[model samples]
Structure formats: structure tokens, C-alpha cells
Target chain A: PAWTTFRVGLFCGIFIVLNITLVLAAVFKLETDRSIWPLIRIYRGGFLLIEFLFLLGINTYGWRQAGVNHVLIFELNPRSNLSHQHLFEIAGFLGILWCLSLLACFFAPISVIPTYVYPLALYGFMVFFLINPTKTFYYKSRFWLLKLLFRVFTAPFHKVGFADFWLADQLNSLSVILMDLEYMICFYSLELESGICHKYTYGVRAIVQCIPAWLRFIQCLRRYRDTKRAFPHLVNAGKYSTTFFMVTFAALYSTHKERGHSDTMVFFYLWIVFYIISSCYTLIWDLKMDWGLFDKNAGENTFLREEIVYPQKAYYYCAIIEDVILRFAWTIQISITSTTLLPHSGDIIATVFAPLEVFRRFVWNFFRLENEHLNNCGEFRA
Target chain B: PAPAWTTFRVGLFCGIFIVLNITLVLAAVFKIWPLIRIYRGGFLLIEFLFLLGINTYGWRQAGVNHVLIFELNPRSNLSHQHLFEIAGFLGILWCLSLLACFFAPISVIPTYVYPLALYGFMVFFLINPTKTFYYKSRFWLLKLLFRVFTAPFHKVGFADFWLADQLNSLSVILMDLEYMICFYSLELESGICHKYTYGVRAIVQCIPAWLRFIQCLRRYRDTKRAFPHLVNAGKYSTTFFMVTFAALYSTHKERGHSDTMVFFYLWIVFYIISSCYTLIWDLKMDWGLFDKNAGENTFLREEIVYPQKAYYYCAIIEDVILRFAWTIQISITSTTLLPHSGDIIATVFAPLEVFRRFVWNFFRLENEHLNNCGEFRA
Candidate 1:
């Protein structure tokens, strides 16, 4: 027990030191000779991905504390099941590795390692660790995650599971990371080839953001195909379809507006329309369908469902307000951007929202698993 | 019984001929010297109000046919009442009066007489001195409408809430109703009348939402649970922002301000948000569908009053689609060029909302009757 305590404290200590170094790297700005926007965008996404990974550890940790059978829900083998401590250890290790590599690029400079190659090298290490054939690490857990990723990638072809769709929803929230990954790919390729590249093409960025939305949309359809019932599956697919149009028009507006085209008004209008629609639809679904809140006959519980898994009532109430406020967070972004209220608001808002979305998913996870548990309890088989 | 059926058919026949003549009169365009847009707008609201009146009877008739307890309800003593035939007769009478007014040769009759005639007959009939005019039924409606008008002063009732919601649906017509008063009273200096009407239009439209909003607060004060009423009150409160932005947007457009886009954007966003909130309330809270224990049903509650599942599905699909139909008003182009196009859209969307409210009624009362199976015929 003392060793476990010692290990956790060591993980936290390393996490703190690594994060402080990353903060210092940002402060220095490296004053690198190249345009920093590209580097900064990648850094932003990379840091967010790490933060969400840490929150995933915390989410599963909360699930265990709340008596949710997440191990059983995930259908993991009991022997191979990993705890939140294991996840935090993995996160801390990965965060340290990322910090060291980026800092190395700063200290060594491009003359030594080609600043682009540092990020490339970091990505390469992740791929190797992910697909490592050796059983030295937690191979079963790594393979389990890889299998879920594979299912999400080829969602339409495979059978759907709670884990597959759940992972798919998680990916759906990481549009920033996915788009950054695409930008990184383009950044290195175009830079090495000696072709001029400032920002990635609008078409490429749009395609990157669409990947998770399209996968989730297809998974909904695939589930409908498997089960004859379309009540929820088809309706849920409609929810994802709103994101498709929302992103499409959003990209169209930004690209056309930058090009100084006057005919872009329709795109802007449609983008706002879809944005509000998508936000409202998803917010309502989160409350009414997913979390099963807003019941008329909630009996003891006011707006929440009749049966709640959480011991405390205030958490659910706070989650409702928090979910609503963050759901329309982009509305605030619009005002800030349109009025030119802040310098570099685009980057600031994206950075703020990506993690807020992660926290949203963290809040979402507790109720999602709670609803899953209660549904299983209804069948008397959990 | 046969005579009663014959009378209903005659009423329908008269309604047809009168409407046809009114259409023919519109074809003639009247060629009136003054601007006819005001008259046209008033006619549009009047016709829609009549259509909704017809729908009320049809809605209640359907409720009775489906075995809902509208008769044993209202907590009124068992007594004489009216029926759909009587509603048809009243419709025919009003249609005939309206047709005569519009079709009268332009110079031969004062146009103001038409509005005065309608109001005089309406108020006189409702407050008739004799029992000949279905005095009990008239006062029943008048008293309920009065209570709805004084919502906070009265205990909330089933009829009061139902009537208040109808007023919410008739908000566009209510706006036009205020327009009618301003048009005549201000003596129609076309531009002056139009400018000030926008100010009053926002306030008049706010009345119904505020009425329902206050009713919710009063219920919260009296009821044990504050959450439902408080939440319901928020739905109406959103409309206040929606109406404000809408009025300000139009005002900016008239004054030719460059910053009209801000209000325009707020208007559209809040309108969509408010519409969505109301639609969800209609489905989840009002109708009590979409509950967790929605057993043995698809996209519906466990218990449904109407036997046919298709009706529920169709009503729900229609309700959801129609609730957002006002969005199409923004998409409609080229309305600016046509004369009286504003009045034309008022006529168009006003009836559409009335029809939506009509469809809203069958299910609303069904839900209410279902609730009454437990309690609250009110």
C-alpha cells in the first residue's frame, strides 16, 4: 500500500515538473525563426489531447468510486482490467515524453534535429508504443484500446458496441486534435518538399473535422441496420448529421469570407442556423435522452430521473447548468470574434473550448455510465 | 335529429358562398383611394381568428368523440351547452357579415363601418340582455377569457391555461388586433401610423406570453413543487428577448442603420431557441410523451388516449415541423417588391400558426384528460 502511495506521489511530482517545463517553453516562445502559429496550433492540440487523456483517468476513477461497474461495462477481462491509477501513470509518462521532445527541439534548434522532426519523432514513438509487439508494457490494455480505435475507424463494417460508440463520441469531441494531426502532416510534408505552405487548405481542414462526425453518424446507421428499431438510432443519426452541415457551412463561411467574396452571406446565415440547431439538439439529447434528466414525475428528485446512481443530488443539478452553459460556449466566441474584442481570440477560444469540451465529456461520463448501470439494473443482470 | 343535420349542412353551405364572394371582392381590389393594406391586414387577422374559432369546435368535438371528459369537466354544474352545429352557425353568421362589408361598393359604404359592425355585434351578443343568444355559454367563455386576462388574480384553471395558450398562438393576430386599433384611432397618417405600430406591436405580442408566464408564477406560488412552474415560466420569458430583438431589428431596418445585423442575428438566434424550448415543452411536459417508462410504444408515452398510433405520430411530426415553420419567413425572398407583401405574409403565417394551434388542441386536451384520469380537469 505504501509503495502504491509512493508511486502516485511520484507520478504527480513528475507531472507537475513536466507541465511547468512546457509552460516555460511556451513563455520563451522559442522566438524560432519560422512562423509560430503552426507550431503553436500543434502545441495547443497536443496539450489538449494530454489533458483529456488525464481526465479519462479521472472519469474512470470517479466511476469506480461511485460504484459503477465500468470494468464490466467495458467488458474487459478481469485479469487485464486497468484502474485509474494505471491510466494516470500512463498519462504522466506520455506527458513527460512529449515535454522532453518539444523542449529538445527548442534547445537543439532546427540546425541539429529539424524542429519539424521533433514532432514527427514524437508521433513516431506513439505509433510504435501503440503497436509494439513486445509484451513488456500493458499489452492487453493497449490492444484493447487499439481494437476500439479500429472499430471506430471502420465503424460501418463492424458490429457496434457501447465501447465503440462511446469511443466514437469521445473522438467526436477532439476535432481540434484531429485537425491538428492533419495540419502537422501537411506542415512537415510541405516544409520538407520546399513548397510554400502557410495555413493548411480549407478543404483539408474541413475533411479532418468531418472524420469523427462521419464515423459517429455511420455508427448510428450501422446500429440501426443491426437492430430493426430506428426510434433512437435514426434520430441519433440525425443529431450527428446536423454537425456535418454545421461544419460544412462553417468552413464555407470562413474560407469565402477570407477570400472577400460578397456571396458568402448565405453560408454565414446557414452556419449560424445549423450551429444553434446542433447546439440545441445535442443539449436536449444530453438532458432528455442520455442522462435521463428532466423527468416530470421525478418523485423525490425534482428535474432528474426517478432513479439516480449518484449519492449526492447537487452534482446532477450542477452538471445540468454546467452542460447548458458550455454547450453554447461558441455563442460567446462569436461575439468576441465579430467585435474583434480580443487579440488572437481565435486561438484563445479554441484552446479554451477544447478543454471545456473535455471537461464536459468528463461530466457526461458519470451520468452516461450511471444510465447504463440503471438500464442494466432494470434487466436485473448488472 | 335530421333537422339538426340539415341545419349544419345549410350553415356550411352559407360559409362556402360567403367565402367565395369575399374572394371575388378581393379580386376586384376595391381600387380604394386610401391605402388598403391596413384593411387587408385587419381582414387577414379577422379571417384567421375565425378559422381558429372553427378549429376550437372541431378540436373539442374530436375530444368528445374520443371519449374525453370535456362535458363532466370545467367543474361547471351540469346544464345546457352548445355543440359543433352551433359553432358552424356562428361562423356562418360572422362570415356573412364580413362578406357584405368587403363586397359593398367602395364609395357607397364607409369602410370603418365594417370593423365597428363586427365589434358591436360581437360585444352585444356576448353581453346580450336576453337568454336568446345562448347567454350561459357566452358568459362561460367571457368569464374564462376574463379570468385569463386577469390571470394572476384568479386561481389557475384548466380552461384558463388552455385559453391563455391559444392567445400565445394568436400572438401574431393579437399584434394585428393592436394594429387595427391604432389604424383607426390614429386616423391612418400611413407613415406615422406605421412607425408607432412597431412600438405597440412588441408590447401587444408580449401580453400573451406574459399572461402565461404570470400564470406559471402564480401556480408556483400555490403549488408544492416550484421546479416545473419555474421552468415553464422560463420558456415564456425567452419570448421577451425574442420579441425585443425582432422589434429592434425591424426598427433599425426602417431607420437605415448600419448596425442592424446585430439585432437581426439576435432575433434569429433567440427566435430559434425560444421555438425549440416551446416545442420540447409541448412534447415532454405538456403532452407527457417521451417519458422513461414509454413502454410498448414508439416515440410515445406508455399510455395514449387515442387508439390509433398513427395519429400520435402524425401529430408529433407535424407539430415539430410546423413549430419551426416560421423560419421559412426569413428565407422567403422578393416579398419586398410586391405591394402589401407585408400584409400578405401576415395572412400567410398567421393562419399557419392557427392551424398549428388547432392541431395542438386535440393532443393538448387528450393529455389534459389523461391527467384528469388522475386529477385536474382544470
Candidate 2:
């Protein structure tokens, strides 16, 4: 009984205190609303800080995995490193000023002004990274121009801290963007894996994904087969959607660029059927799979995940970031490289890419690409 | 050189016979144009008869296997049956006259007559079926109206030949019509058996037979599961169609006052998807199966073969004419009955029309309705 009384009494006492405090707070508020405005201001500022910090935390992880050393500070060297740390610290400190300018509109309504503040804020951050290359902004700004050059030229010159300025960038981001360029360059030379070729492959994949998303689809079917239960072919329209998607993707790819004008409309229809079915199937399948697989845990899942490869954002990036050398290997496989065979005999651009073809090969072979190099340096033979 | 020429000449001599016959016939036609006109007349008549004969021949083999006697004929007497044959033959002969009134112009005109002829021809044939109960016309006419009354009442009075007076009719015509009526009747009572019902059992068995049609669908799959591949899944867009068809038929039978009002439009949409897909799948599967199993001695087979009781029209027949009993049966099993129920409801009309469902069930049950139904029924 005492235990029960004590527990009840404790909750009652706490609530009493809470009410008294709220009463006192209301009195204080009436005394002069302006007095606590600064407290409110600081509170709002803290909330905004947490929000942006959270946003950065999420975006920064992939970059962190890349082991980026944005400032290039210690990685570059000592008294110089000392000054570098000072600059990085100074830049980071200034990064806060970057946040302060973000307050440029804290008191203002976002809809009223941010036609300007948003861009101004971005520019302010760019200036923050300029104080020293150690900041993330510095690498985000420069990786596009530099990583390939460094990796390309510095075989012997490279080491862990070989480029202090770039090391701070997220490996994923840098590689993702790098692949974007690499694959873009690769695509520039395409005949088409599917023409399913150049124009159509681009068009097909675009249409396929554009299918309006089918929300969750997979739940009701009895998982009759253990293996299928794993993949659950019947449950989600996923199997059907993916099957149809692949068939559409590949079937369209069968046409070559030289043959596209002849193949376009037909392929367009094929793509349309694919997308409609895929969208519906995807929606239906995702719903089932979502219920069957995802809902038991996450409760909602998108039919959205397809074999989403990074760098697909650009046909070029589709291959470039692909372990560069692989980009070259797959490119050659999908296209004819020998001038004698002429995948496209008449197009100037097709032939001109021979230079890139030559460069890709010479560079790749010079790298003496071998599986051993990727491994523990076991036998290096091939 | 002599041998080669002789071989060629022999073929030429044969061609000569064909050509001369044609030439002589054309010459005589001009000589007395009306003389052969009657002969010419019947060729067209014969051609139309064969057109429908072949059509019925194609659709009815499976039905014939059901060996139905819509009415027994005093004609096919056991001992000296030949006389009955004569009667049947004569009846068949008289039946042709039934088409005779199907004139080129009940009204007039080369310009308007084909349209008029077609409409008249249809009316003439309906009238043709109005003979004595001993005749085929009697069976067709009353079947158009009466079996429901007799079958409903005879609870005990019926026997194999009471209808011989009725059934001298083609066995194909009867079982088919019987199943049509039986399953159709079965379909007349529904609320989804899994309604878990008198509201259903009767409706459902009606469905099982309705579903019995789906049997052939799974049959085309692999037949390994002895069932499925004997049927393939896609072979039916077939299953879906039949499944939907049965569901629609039975679902509407939920309220049985001979009203089919609830089964329209939506079911129509469903039926379209089912049949369109079934037709397409049937065609596609046929071309492929025709090349594969049909061409080769039916080899490396999943090894499930029904008595193949009814001819499958090389696989095309499976989809088009299912009394839809099996569709109903299979739907129930897929839904409830055995709890893990195996959908075998509907009339005697249901599973008994096994050319398809028995094969489907044997293969499916052999395959156990799971993977091999997916795989080895594969």
C-alpha cells in the first residue's frame, strides 16, 4: 500500500510542481513579452542548429566513409601543418559565421524572402571553405577538377596523404561524381548496349523508371516455396515487374543506333507497355512485398528500389565511377573497339571516340590491370 | 535419260487427267448450264455443312468423351443396330432439308439478298429443331426449354434412356449441353463457398465443374507436378480467366432467382481479360507446344497424361470451352474447402468433366499444389 501510495503521491507532486512552474511562467510572460524574446531567440537558434547539423550528419557519412581530409592540414605537413590546422580551425569557426548569416532570415518568413537568402547562404558557405582547403566545401568544389588528374598522374607520387586538399572528401561522393564523369565519358562512345542503343537505351531506361511509382505491393500470397519465399516471386508483382522491365530493357537494347530511326516507335511502344506494366506491377508487387516482407518490420516501403546503380544519373557516369578500369572493360564489351569492324561506319563522333578508346586502353593496360593488384598482391601474373 | 523422262512423263500424265477433267467439266457447263447447277448447288451446301461440322467436330470431341446421350434413340437398338443407323442416317438426311429452306432469298435480290439470306438462314435453322421428341430437333428444342423441369423432378424417375426418345441425339451434343446446364445450374447458386455455405456448397460444386476447365490450363504448364506443366501457369492467362469466370459466375449465383444481372460489365471486363489472355496464351502456347510436345512424340515429358480423355485440339480447345466447372472447383480449393481446400465443388457437372481438371488435379496433387505445380508440374 505504501509503495502504491508513494508512487501515486510522487506523480501527483510532480504534476503539482509542473503546474506551479507553468503558472509562474505565464506571470513572467505577462510582465513583458520582450524580456524573454532573447531566450526564445536563442532557443529557436539552437533548434535550427540541430536541424542543419542533423542534415549534415546524414549527408556527411558517405563522405566520411571515403576518409576525406578536406582541409589537407596534417596530411600536407608540420609548421605548414600547424598553420593548416589554424586555417582549418579558423575556417570551421567561420563556418559558424556561415550559420549566423543563416540567421539572416531567422526572424523573417521563409516564403517572403528566401528567393534570395537561399542562394546567399550557399555563397556564404562557399566563402567559408575558401579560408582553407580543409573544409568539405573546398573538396566538393574541387574534386571534379582534381581527383582524376591526381590519380592519373601520380602513380608513384601517390600515398595515403598524397593530396591533402582532396583526402577529406567522402569517398562515396567523390567516386560517385567521378563515376558520373567516367560513365558519361564511356556513354559518349556508346553504340548502345540495348539500342537498346544510344538514343533508345537512354529513352527506355528513362521511361521505365518514370512509370509513376506503385506504392507498397507484396503482402498476401502464401509463401509456398521456400526459395521463392526468399525472392517471393508470386507475392509481389516485383518478379513480374522486374521480369518485364528486364525484358523491355534488353529487347529495346537489341536495336543499334544506326537502326534507331527504324526501331524507335516500336521500341517506344515497348517501353510504354513496360512502364505501364512495371508501374502497376511495381505498385502491386511492392505492396505485397511491403506487407509480406517490409511491413512486418518497417511497415511501409517503396516499390521504388530497382537495381539502382549509382552514376546512372548520367549515361556517362553509369560507367565512369565503375572502378574506372571496369568502365573501360564493360565499354569495350558493349561496343566494338577495332576500327576495322566499324560499329558505326559513317558517324564522325563514333570514329573520333577512337582517341578515347586508345587512351582508355593504353592507360588501363599501362596500369597493368590485374586481379592480383586488387588482392594481396598474390601473383600479379595477368 | 529414258528413265528420267519416263518418271517425269508419268507425273505429267496424272496432271493431264486432272486438267482434262476440269476442261471437260467447264465445257459441259456451257452445253447445258442448268444440268449441273444442282450439282454446283450442293457443293456450296456441302461446303457450309462441313464448315459447321468441322467446327462442332473440333469442339465436341471432348464432350463426346463424356459420352452424353441428350436423348436415347430407339434407333440404335442393341441387336441389329444397323437399322437404327439407317434411321439416324435418314434423320441426318432430313436434317439437311432443315437447311434447305435456308434460301438465298426469302425476299429477293442479288444486292440485298446476302444480308437477307444470312438472317433467313439463321431463322430457318431455329425452326428446323421443331420435330417430334424422337428427333434431334426435339432434343434441341426442349433443351432450349425443358431439361430443367424433368431433371428437377425426376429426383428418382430418370434413367439412362427415358430420354432416348430425347437422346438419339449426338452424345457430344448432350454432355456438352448437360454440363452447360448442370454447371450453369450449379453456377446459379453462389456466395463464394468459402463464405465458408448452402449459400455455397451447391454453388461451389457448380464452380468446381466451372473450374474443371482450369485443369487444362495447369495441364499445359509442365505436367510434372503431373498437373501444372501438363499445363503451364501462363498457359492460361488461362487460369486467371477461368478463375475470374468461375468467381463471377458463382459470386453472382449468390442470389439465385435466374438473375444474371449482377454478373455483367465488371465480370465482362474480367471475362475479357481472362479470355483475351487465355486466347492469346492458348495461341502462343499452342504454337510453341505444337512445335514441342505435339511435334516430337510428346517426349522428355513431365509424364502426366490424362486419358487425355478429350482431345485438346492440340491444346487450343482447353481454354475456349471449359464448362467453367473446374474454374469454380479450383477457386474454392485455392480459397478454402479442404481448409487447405482443394477446389472440387460444382455439379456432377464439376469434376466428372475431367478431361481437363482431372489432369490438372492429378498433376497438381501429384505435384502437391506448391512448387512443382510451379516447377515439375514443372
Candidate 3:
């Protein structure tokens, strides 16, 4: 009934407009002082979140195409659910407004307008849009998301389900963004004297880094309490416990280095030790537990699962290779221990690595959903 | 084999018998006491342990099946005899050590080493790998303690919350451990240590409140509803604020500044409100009394676990009186009555609290047992 070309054309037009606005902001950003760099990171995080939504919509499209009943899986009401197109439209819409806000940041050079209000307006508008009770913006779906987010925030207090943990795992990969969010708070509240903000941020980061891991760890304990199954649940808790040590030692190492302590190497070694252990456990879990790969009697599929959902067999083989490679994404940081070998590449390198982690999770979701779907079908047959 | 009334009477007599010796020593002794702080910690714990036995005995007498509730083997359950034996032995040892430290020369045995050795022996007894010291019960208690320490991470069961509530009442004893720690480490070696420093003391004092608060949240989560648990959390939140204000006020006064009248008054107000809140919860919720039913029991629940109505009335009076007992210490005359009035008040108040907690446990378990009985019928 609808013109697919017209819809695609309109979306592309907005996308191009977003790109042009971002380009204009970047051009104007070069003329301005670097004082707004923290603000830049904040805006970057918001954009990344929007991009994350876009990628999720793409994943949802793949799920739909592959005949995965995500509506039932996510416990979404079928009639009122947002399709992949709906998600992309919102993503594009938000991204443009965000870019427009970034463009508005340039108006500060004129000295009359409070350009800081633009970012605040952008964030506030997005929040208001999401929380709007009216029927205009898919109210049920937005509230459903808010509900899932609330459940994730209160992880240990309640019984967790697939969607809860699934979204929590997504948050797990967004640790950088989590830290960035704290930076956003520190930046706005202090308004400057970021040296002091940086001082306090280190301590905040230490606690902030452990939150998602701690939530996952306690969620594991809650599951252990409910199911009384120490095998996998406790084992899963150990993985997150490893993350706690990893973050703790990493923060310690960072702290010691900042203070120019000689014993900083000890924490560096500790951080590396935990990181490797944590990565190994996750790698093993991903293959053995989550995706249900690496079976002995997988037959013609070799190391892969018996039921291959995707068309291409090569994809699974390459995915294993990609996952193993991406699991050691910290290898780059390991090479450059004391700050960075490249000057002025601190945030750039970190920012570059953030999306790789997101990409890793993106690849991860396809297989995770497939496994969950297979399990659902298996249960139905049983 | 059943301790019905005979065992109860024997323990009660022995309890009084030990109490007579304690009072005699405490009253008649030439009070020369920071080693005293460490000794007080030991004696307070000993007193609390004995009172715990008395309380547990009362629960058993109320016909409460705590053995079943905590999922302990009924055969291996420590009856009041076992409880009394431990209590009597520890009480005797502590009294002996106290006498040795004060009356005997310090050259014979260092004053600090007296309670230190008693603590060592008590610790060794609990953790002893040998089967001599009721190892099952010891380990079970340790397990419960550990569960309480890591309150929010683990699930909050009935036994977990019960032990946590007991710990909440005995928070002062835990706070004394901090005093004892500072005395031994800082003051014993160097006498310039402040009376009770803010940092570690406040941390230890707030722990029971924190544990109980987390346990409330876990219960809220588990039950998937929030009537009592959330409201109970409000009670502990007040306690937390009260402790915070008291610590701030005390810390201010320690620095020779009396200008923090706001904190002092806030602490007082919060202390009163917190006491009243907990007292109300204790009577109505935990004890499950003050019912509207007029059949036989008036102003109390329909079923009274203890045979006598007078005991319940006495307990109600006792709890209300002692709950607001801090008002006595607030008076100017009370402080001027004794030279080391703070120390004297703590010594007097700590036991009062233990006795109050002892009474609370009996009624709490009585109500819990009654609830189980109702479940069986309805």
C-alpha cells in the first residue's frame, strides 16, 4: 500500500541532512576553543546511543527475516509493536535533531545566545519524547523500554528474564558510555575547573565501572537462590567477579600511574591477569553456553550447532574467528601501557574501541537470539 | 529429654545464680579501668551470649519449632542445657579474668592479655575443627552470620531476617568491638587516642542498620509487593540518619566546639522518633499484637503463646520504658552524678538493651510460631 521508495527516499534525505549538519558542526568546532571537548564526548555518547538503537533495529529486521518471533520473546504486544522501520525512523529523527543541536553549539561564538542550552534541550527533548504519555510516539513501546530499563537498574531486587539480562548484557558492553554519562554529570555540575572534576571522576569511575558487573553478579546470585543451580549460575557469577577484579586493578593501576607511584606495575599485572581470565570465561561461555556451539556430534556442521539458522555456513566459521579476535580488544591498550604512544590520541583510541565492542555485541545478538528461538521451539515441541 | 519446665527452671536458677556473682563483682569491685573498655567488650559479649541463651530457651518454651524453621535437625538442636553450659562457662571465665586483671598484679598477667586470652579461647572454641564444642551448631551460626554480613547479595529467608533483627538490637555490642579495637591498637600502645573516634565507630554502628535495610529490600523483591518491607526500611532509614547526626555532633564536640546545636537537637529528635518507630514495629508487627479482637485477649492478639497475660503486659511496659531510656542520659543531673558518667551510662544501658532484646525474641518467636499454627489450620 505504501511507497517503499518514497519512505526510503525521505529517510535518506534526513540522513544526508544529518551528515551535512554534523559536517557543519565539525567545521565550526575547529574554530572554537577545545574547552568543549568534554561536551563533545557527551554529545558523542548520545549519538552513539542513537546509533545503537539504529543497529538494534537492523538486528530486529534480520530477526524478522529469519522468522524469529521476537514479539513473543520480548513479551511485546504484537498489534502495537514497533517494526524495524519504526525504529529506524525514530533513530534517524533523533540523530538529525542531535546533529541540529550540535550545529546550534556553533552559535556560541556570537556571544549572545546560551548555546549550552542546545545540548540540554536536545537531551531533554529526547527524554520528553520517550516519556510522552500521548499516543503519538508509540507510547506502549516507549514505556515498555522504560520498564525494561528500570528492571535492569533494579536487577538484584527482582526475578530477571531473557529480555532483562539481554538488555543488561547490552549495558555491559556500554561501560564506556556509562562512564561518559558520569563525565556528563561532572561536566555540567562543575561547569569548569575540570581538573577537580577529573580528580573526583577517577574515584567515581572506580565505583561506576563495577556497577554493571556487580548487577550481573548479584543477578547471578539471585538466580542461584531461585534455582539452586550452582553449576552455571555461580559459574556465571564468577565471570562477573573476575570483571570486578579487572576493573578494580585497572582503576588502581590508573590511579597509581596518575599519582606517579612505582608500584603501579603491580596493579597493571593484576589488571592484565583478570582481564585474560574474564575474557577466557566469556569466550568459553559464548561458544559453549549462549550460542550452544562447539558440540562433539554436530555432524556436518562440524564445530557449530546442529541447527544452523542462517543460510551461509561460512558466517559461523568467520564469526568464531571474529569473536576470538574481538575478545582481546584490550590488546591495543596492552601495547600502549603508559598513556598512548601516539600523542593526542587518548579519547580517539578509546572512542574507536567503543564501537568495536558494540560491533562485537551486535554480532553476538544474532546468534543469541537464534539460540533462544531454538530453545523456545524445542520447548514447544516437548 | 524435653526441657519443658524442669530444664527451664534449672537454667533460670543458674542464670540468676551467675547474675548474683556478676552483680557482686560489678558493684563491690574497686573500679580502676582502657583495658576496662576491652574487658567491657568481652563481658558485654558474654552477657549478650547468656541473654541469647535465655531468649532462645523462652522461644523453645513458647513451643516454637525454630529447629524446623531454620531447617536444623531437631535431635542435634542445642537445647537450653547446651546453651546454659556455654553461657555459664564463658560467664565464669570472663568474671575470673576480670578479677585477675583488677585484683591481681599486672606483672603476673598483663591487663590487656586477660580479655585477649579469653577472646582467643572463645574464638578457638567456635572455630575448633574437633567435634567437642557442638561444631554443627557453631558452623550453622557462623553460616548465618556470614549470610547476614553479605545481606543483599543473598536471599532473605525468615531465619536470615530474624538473625539480622537480633543483630540490629545488639548493634551497641558491635559498636563496642570498635571501641575495643581502638583501645587495643591505638590507646593501649599510645594513650592519646580520643574516646571514640568517628570513622570506624560510625561504620560499625551503621552496619546493622545497613544489613537490615538491605534485607528489607531483598524481602521486597522476593515478595514482589511492598507493604511492610518498604515501611520497615523507613524505620532503618531513620536510624541511619540518627546515627549520622549523632556521629557528626559527637565529632564536633570532640574538637571542643559546642556550636553544632542543630546536629545535637536533630540527633535527639531522630533518636526519639527512631525509638518510637521501632517500638511500634516491635509491638505491632514483629510481636503481632494489639489486635482489635475482643473475644478473650483484650488489647493483645487472640492467641498468647505464653500462658500468663502479666508477662506480656510487663514486656510491653519494659520495652516502651527502655526504648525511651536514652532520655535519662540527656539530663544534666544524670551526667554530674558519676565521674566517668558516659562510661557508667554505657555499662548500665548495654545490659538493659540486652534484656529488652531478650524479651523481644521471646514474643517475636511466639508470634512467628502462632503464624505457622494459623497456616496449619487455615
lDDT, candidate 1, residue A299? 91
TM-score of chain A of 1: 0.85
DockQ per model, Cα: 0.00, 0.00, 0.00
Interface RMSD of each: 40.9, 57.0, 41.2
Cα-based lDDT at residue A46, candidate 2: 25
Location of the lowest summed lDDT over 10 successive residues in candidate 3 chain A: A334-343
TM-score of chain B of each: 0.79, 0.24, 0.84
Error of 3 at A278 (Å): 2.0
Which rank order by lDDT, best down to worst?
3, 1, 2
Candidate 3 has an interface RMSD (Å) of: 41.2
Best by lDDT, which number? 3
- A best-first ranking of the candidates according to their TM-score comes to 1, 3, 2
What root-mean-square deviation over C-alphas does model 1 reach? 27.2
Error of 3 at B162 (Å): 94
In candidate 1, stretches whose alpha carbon ends up further than 4 angstroms from where it belongs are A1-34, A109-111, A192-201, A330-344, A376-382, B1-378
